[PDB]
Design a protein around this ligand. Structure first.
Ligand SMILES: NC(=O)C1=CN([C@@H]2O[C@H](COP(=O)(O)OP(=O)(O)OC[C@H]3O[C@@H](n4cnc5c(N)ncnc54)[C@H](O)[C@@H]3O)[C@@H](O)[C@H]2O)C=CC1
Ligand SMILES: NC(=O)C1=CN([C@@H]2O[C@H](COP(=O)(O)OP(=O)(O)OC[C@H]3O[C@@H](n4cnc5c(N)ncnc54)[C@H](O)[C@@H]3O)[C@@H](O)[C@H]2O)C=CC1
Ligand SMILES: NC(=O)C1=CN([C@@H]2O[C@H](COP(=O)(O)OP(=O)(O)OC[C@H]3O[C@@H](n4cnc5c(N)ncnc54)[C@H](O)[C@@H]3O)[C@@H](O)[C@H]2O)C=CC1
Ligand SMILES: NC(=O)C1=CN([C@@H]2O[C@H](COP(=O)(O)OP(=O)(O)OC[C@H]3O[C@@H](n4cnc5c(N)ncnc54)[C@H](O)[C@@H]3O)[C@@H](O)[C@H]2O)C=CC1
Ligand SMILES: NC(=O)C1=CN([C@@H]2O[C@H](COP(=O)(O)OP(=O)(O)OC[C@H]3O[C@@H](n4cnc5c(N)ncnc54)[C@H](O)[C@@H]3O)[C@@H](O)[C@H]2O)C=CC1
Ligand SMILES: NC(=O)C1=CN([C@@H]2O[C@H](COP(=O)(O)OP(=O)(O)OC[C@H]3O[C@@H](n4cnc5c(N)ncnc54)[C@H](O)[C@@H]3O)[C@@H](O)[C@H]2O)C=CC1
Ligand SMILES: Nc1nc2c(ncn2[C@@H]2O[C@H](COP(=O)(O)OP(=O)(O)OP(=O)(O)O)[C@@H](O)[C@H]2O)c(=O)[nH]1
Ligand SMILES: Nc1nc2c(ncn2[C@@H]2O[C@H](COP(=O)(O)OP(=O)(O)OP(=O)(O)O)[C@@H](O)[C@H]2O)c(=O)[nH]1
Ligand SMILES: Nc1nc2c(ncn2[C@@H]2O[C@H](COP(=O)(O)OP(=O)(O)OP(=O)(O)O)[C@@H](O)[C@H]2O)c(=O)[nH]1
Ligand SMILES: N[C@@H](CCC(=O)O)C(=O)O
Ligand SMILES: N[C@@H](CCC(=O)O)C(=O)O
Ligand SMILES: N[C@@H](CCC(=O)O)C(=O)O
Lengths: 501, 501, 501
């Protein structure tokens, strides 16, 4: 998208890592309380850091499918497993003609660090199939997905205990259903956990409430934790809260649409929505329900009645918050000086080059990094995986017990008070509030997903802020996130003896 | 080695394939006895040929080893499995800093076509570890080999029934022994065929007589089959036989040395020997046993007392037969016009670019192609694999029975003659000749390897010659070999229904 | 059986090994082609020899059976796997109250060296169940055998690719049939080689012709090879051949009975037969079929009509050849001076202590050692295992072809002779001798077992004699055998890198 500043994607992520490694290297050496206090301490710390960076296993595939017209075609595919310091590996499947070994390796490493940031016990992985799904029938896409699943399974690149895929660009519920069905019907036929081989499944198939919207929901929570922190909003020259703010959204897919829904719900105003074919704009606000309904009907956002076909880059629209939610390397050395927003919330994976990060720093623009902000997807995938391993819906064993227990608890307060203020205090009814009445039976699956996600995004934001203050990083939240990720992954490699050697 | 003519190695091999595919496409379509004779027959033929060309599975590895000095290093590795129309896959392991995904994919496809040429029932595969072995201790090389084996085994890229490695550049007997030992001691502990997981083993560990020298022995047999056809020697302006010819050898490794031993044994004269550091030259002849003894003593060819340090390209030395036995892409557009030899016998894999083949054709230079000429290695690896599966040394069950049987057979002739020519004819002793006495017990392992190899190289040469005449290919033996390979591999894909789709 | 001289059985075998190790160390060090020509050479030779001696894996079992009367009883069992330099492991199952961990470890190591002596590609193993089979019903023995098989199988101590048992003291065809049936019906249900999990099976279940008598047949061949070498019979002061000699047999089981049958068949005369309850004696000779038919009828040897209940040790009976074919450590310090025989042929495993070997050497008594002499059992077990892996009876594919081929061969001689001695010489019939007519179709299973065994015993006797001359060992054949065994096993450990460490 830019021939001036177009770094190799894997190496760009390695650069981000190098930078966080630079900052913590002292802390790692000093923690290390080995008798070698000689600066082979320094040496073993940077030997371990070199082990963490490259992907351990990458599988490249070519397999034939026969198209609906009868033609034979060769499909190309890839899956990278970056780290196995936690198992299984976790990461999505991308259907796109931009798929390549380097793109997949880069996203696989992002998954490792992202999972470490939100304390999700998975190593990183990613897959890609180099096709444009719009050029294939549904029957052909099913054939490609099912065959890809078996080629991965034959070589140990999918399974509930090694590698658990998930949706990404141009895949969703539908593909995940296909993956889970052919895994469970063949190699997983005797495995009690066969349907935990993949997440993002439909509900009828072991999916979890809110997985489709989960990463949008997490984008809201990530922004909210920082947009409500007066210390960061001072440096930006902006007022805490959502009620008065504007935002623009690049990409109207699963991440972009649901980020818009939740931000709109809490008083922000969507001004611009950009897509693969063009952009639309309205300074008075775009309604997400109307835009979705139009998009579902016409297969495009152009021509939306209540906004005007906007020319020029969606990334340079004037707004408070820019949400790049499409592909990677969209903000570069070129357009970074014209961005006009004061908060960049990366919903997409790797939308900002390192050169663009430098410009944004100089310019007091806050980039909330992908490592943290889009990790709501993998957090709720983690909940889905646990739901599959546990083989019950949350609360089903305890709803009645817990309901009865709570009423007897409140009755214990009632009877204790009547016992004391006897006859002429009268009857002293203790009853639930409206809000407690609605929790009287304990959490359900929906409650766990919402509160578990909010808990994770908040706990992770505080850890990033703590680390940024400690090292005087200002608005370089990306380096603070990598610092936390590196510290966690380093400790695992260090206390494990590294490897089987 | 040449920046004028440096084609991508994988695509260069696909180019060779495309050529042979051109020539046979008609014969494939006409053979095809299917009800719908539309030249959409031609469409299925060219869909199948597109399926055959790319590698099905490629695994890329990164794993850490701790060096002898205590530092951590990250080792990079690769194994490509090109085709599974026959199983297991078969191919060597190369230790070299020139190793790359493309190099490994290219050699893996060469293995498929090579195996089809000599009727060896294996699909093609190849592996590479990106190190220079003369920078590592023996203890480090053992560590790297054993760990590489486990990483391949975990993902299904080594095993007696999927993929059976073998030596290549900078690996031999020693590494194969390490591979077999860690496979059999871990995931092969219950497998009756665990030691058939790799070939080129030492004899004490399941190796077969003559595997080290097998590919040199096959180079001799391949040359002999063509150097003794007067029709091809006419076109070259040359006398049949070896007794009178000179040759030069690029590379003094396992292929180069043994090619020189066998050619020297049958009256050819080695004039020049080139190496990674320099060449040596002597128009009176170099003796292989003194050269190897010098090489073993000094670790180099230079300074050999009975030849001179030759400057300028070994490939340009003046001789009848040039044997490139080092790495690939050594003969290019550049130096092809200065070659001076009349026969180029490719012992190495892919030593000649397609441009250089152009030039050699115009100038009536016969290139005996790698597909055919170096296939003695994989042929004797095949014998080793069968020896492992059978769990007896050849002849051990039958030596005594067979010898007793032969003497009673000769005695049947004796007694029949005496009965007829009674007393007046006397005693009529029927005894073995010296050469039959030597076979009186039947074949041993040594005999099977020697005669089985000779049988294969001759039968394959006659098939290549038959095909070159039938398509008027003259001295383009490479295209004739690919034609035979394609025909055989196409038949398997066609009658199998292609794939489970 | 003797308090004076009753060494620990495992260490006694280690003593034999140490003794052969002492003689070959120099040869091993000098062979060793390595740069550290230091006595770091002798150090690694000494370290490898220490690795070879102990057993790698020993499993000890306790499992309950409910007896026919309804009581519960706890059965004790053991299986030792001594070496895995060849796989699978091979060794018998002994039912005896004298079974112990040390006894089983000792016999397991004997199996390793024995297999190396006759070039049988198995590592050594042995099993024992500590019961007296005479105190159990057939139903109880079946339950014990089947349960023992499952306990071994669960832990990887039986299987066609790890460990293949066989009969020993108080087990035979019957028990092996039980073992094979429960293995193949449970854990081996999908294994193509399930019935190769054990040898010594009945013919109807994959057994091989002559396995029951095989170790007796090998005892005859082992004696033959030495009793016909005039150089050894000189030192003994006796006449080559069998026709004039006497022998006594301790133990009338599977080894003892069949040794007697074959020796009797070639003109030796059995004077004395000893068993667990007593011995019998007759200087005119005992006939083996009469004595077996009496034993089958009465369950004992005593009271045999044609011999006299002999008192005093069977081992001291006056004869030329003493065949101990019962348990171990029967010739000791004590009774070695009173032996009276000139040749001691150990059919049993470890019947002679090292002190008794000392005495026999001083008195010019030839001990043909167990390592060599009783290895006909494991040699024919090896043939049975191969028969199972091959899934055809020998010759079944080729009988008709070979018979037709031989007649056309003889007809080629006949027609060639007529077409030269025309009608001047008449018809010249070329026909098989009686002996060749018997072989006209090629070998059958019976022929391979007989000639394969004879071939093995005589090639092994040669190697022992060669090695005894070369080191001036005289009549210390035991040390010569261990020397050959050690050289072969050392080579494997050396060129394998020892272990994955
Ligand atoms: N799928 C998930 O749960 C998660 C996805 N992500 C990342 O979010 C990003 C996008 O989210 P997806 O779920 O893939 O959405 P999606 O694949 O459902 O839709 C992507 C949208 O972006 C549009 N698009 C593509 N290129 C564009 C361009 N140059 N300009 C404007 N629009 C463009 C497409 O037309 C489509 O509307 C990806 O980078 C993905 O890796 C991150 C975390 C979780
Ligand atoms: N084995 C499999 O293929 C699947 C297993 N599961 C397991 O079930 C556990 C609980 O999830 P749920 O309680 O189902 O969520 P849930 O109770 O919210 O169920 C949602 C939907 O599943 C339906 N459902 C329940 N039992 C069914 C049955 N026997 N046949 C068809 N539909 C049925 C419900 O009626 C509802 O429509 C999960 O932990 C997961 O491990 C879930 C889905 C598929
Ligand atoms: N080893 C085998 O079983 C078979 C090997 N081949 C091919 O034969 C070729 C080499 O045989 P290897 O067994 O690997 O020999 P090797 O690896 O034992 O020795 C290779 C020799 O070539 C020399 N060499 C390397 N680069 C050179 C250069 N640029 N110029 C001159 N000399 C150079 C090296 O110093 C070494 O002496 C490779 O292309 C291999 O793929 C083909 C069929 C079978
Ligand atoms: N399980 C393993 O690791 C090995 C298995 N084998 C199997 O053996 C079969 C036949 O090969 P061989 O007959 O060995 O070829 P071979 O008869 O040429 O013997 C090669 C060498 O192995 C030695 N050898 C024989 N038995 C031995 C033992 N028990 N311990 C140590 N060394 C011994 C021989 O003395 C000879 O020097 C092959 O089909 C193969 O499947 C062979 C070698 C290693
Ligand atoms: N059966 C086989 O395949 C082979 C067995 N062996 C060994 O040969 C020896 C003989 O075993 P098998 O004949 O198979 O067993 P078996 O059970 O058929 O014969 C043993 C016989 O010796 C008798 N006996 C036991 N203790 C005695 C003593 N102190 N004095 C005299 N007789 C006694 C028993 O009552 C029984 O009659 C054993 O040491 C065994 O380890 C060796 C090679 C092969
Ligand atoms: N799967 C099993 O349990 C058994 C398998 N086999 C396999 O057969 C191979 C060759 O041995 P054989 O040819 O049996 O030697 P063989 O030809 O001497 O057969 C021995 C006896 O088995 C009988 N037999 C043959 N086929 C039979 C059938 N379908 N049903 C019942 N009885 C039959 C024959 O009449 C013969 O008398 C062995 O390598 C072995 O693994 C042999 C015996 C049992
Ligand atoms: N695309 C889309 N998804 C919706 C819409 N409304 C609800 N969902 C999603 O459907 C799932 C179930 O929705 P609800 O039953 O309303 O429960 P909910 O979790 O309170 O919904 P939300 O708070 O909006 O996430 C959630 O993942 C919602 O985000 C919608 O209008 N459009
Ligand atoms: N490197 C090397 N190998 C040799 C040499 N001589 C023989 N060999 C190989 O070592 C193995 C054992 O040699 P031999 O016992 O003579 O068997 P062979 O088949 O008659 O030997 P060749 O016909 O020369 O291959 C064979 O594979 C030989 O090719 C040599 O001088 N140098
Ligand atoms: N216990 C016992 N076994 C016998 C007897 N006779 C033969 N056998 C064995 O039973 C099997 C059948 O023997 P045959 O069919 O005659 O074939 P064979 O190979 O010529 O037998 P042998 O030369 O005695 O080994 C062979 O293994 C014999 O060794 C016997 O009298 N008693
Ligand atoms: N593919 C998403 C989520 C992966 C998952 O849910 O496992 C990402 O890029 O983070
Ligand atoms: N590596 C050799 C032979 C491989 C094998 O023997 O399997 C080749 O390039 O053909
Ligand atoms: N148990 C016999 C051999 C058993 C077998 O044939 O494997 C012995 O002591 O040698």
């Amino acid at each position: 998208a830019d021939r001036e500043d177009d770094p190799n994607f894997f190496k760009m992520v390695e650069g981000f890592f190098d930078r966080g490694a630079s900052i913590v290297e002292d802390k790692l050496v000093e923690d290390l309380k080995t008798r070698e206090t000689e600066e082979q301490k320094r040496n073993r710390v940077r030997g371990i850091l070199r082990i963490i960076k490259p992907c351990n296993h990458v599988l490249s595939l070519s397999f034939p499918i026969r198209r609906d017209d009868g033609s034979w075609e060769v499909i190309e595919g890839y899956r990278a497993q970056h780290s196995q310091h936690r198992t299984p590996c976790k990461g999505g499947i991308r259907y796109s003609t931009d798929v390549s070994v380097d793109e997949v390796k880069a996203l696989a490493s992002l998954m490792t660090y992202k999972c470490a940031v939100v304390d999700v016990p998975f190593g990183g992985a990613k897959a890609g199939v180099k096709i444009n799904p719009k050029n294939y029938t549904d029957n052909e896409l099913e054939k490609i997905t099912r065959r890809f699943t078996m080629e991965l399974a034959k070589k140990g690149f999918i399974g509930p205990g090694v590698d658990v895929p998930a949706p990404d660009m141009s895949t969703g519920e539908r593909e995940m259903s296909w993956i889970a069905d052919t895994y469970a019907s063949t190699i997983g036929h005797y495995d009690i956990n066969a349907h935990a081989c993949v997440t993002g499944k439909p509900i009828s198939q072991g999916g979890i409430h809110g997985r489709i919207s989960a990463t949008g929901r997490g984008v809201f929570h990530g922004i909210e934790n920082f947009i409500n922190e007066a210390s960061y909003m001072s440096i930006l020259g902006m007022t805490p809260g959502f009620g008065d703010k504007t935002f623009a959204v690049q990409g109207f897919g699963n991440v972009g649409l649901h980020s818009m829904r939740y931000l709109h719900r809490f008083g922000a105003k969507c001004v611009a929505v950009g897509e693969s074919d063009g952009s639309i704009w309205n300074p008075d606000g775009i309604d997400p329900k109307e835009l979705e309904d139009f998009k579902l009907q016409h297969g495009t956002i152009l021509g939306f009645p209540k906004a005007k076909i906007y020319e020029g880059s969606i990334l340079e629209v004037d707004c408070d918050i820019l949400i790049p939610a499409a592909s990677e390397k969209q903000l570069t050395k070129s357009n970074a000086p014209r961005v006009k927003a004061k908060i960049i919330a990366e919903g997409a994976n790797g939308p900002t080059t390192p050169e663009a990060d430098k410009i944004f720093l100089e310019r007091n623009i806050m980039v909330i990094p992908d490592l943290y902000l889009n990790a709501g997807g993998v957090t709720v995938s983690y909940f889905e995986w646990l739901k599959n391993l546990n083989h019950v819906s949350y609360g089903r064993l305890t709803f009645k017990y817990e309901r009865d227990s709570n009423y007897h608890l409140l009755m214990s307060v009632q009877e204790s008070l009547e016992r004391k203020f006897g006859k002429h205090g009268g009857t002293i009814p203790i009853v639930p509030t409206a809000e407690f009445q609605d929790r009287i039976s304990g959490a359900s699956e929906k409650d766990i997903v919402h509160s578990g996600l909010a808990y994770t995004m908040e706990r992770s934001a505080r850890q990033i802020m703590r680390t940024a203050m400690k090292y005087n990083l200002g608005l370089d939240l990306r380096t603070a996130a990598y610092v936390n990720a590196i510290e966690k992954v380093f400790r695992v490699y260090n206390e494990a003896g590294v490897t089987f050697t």
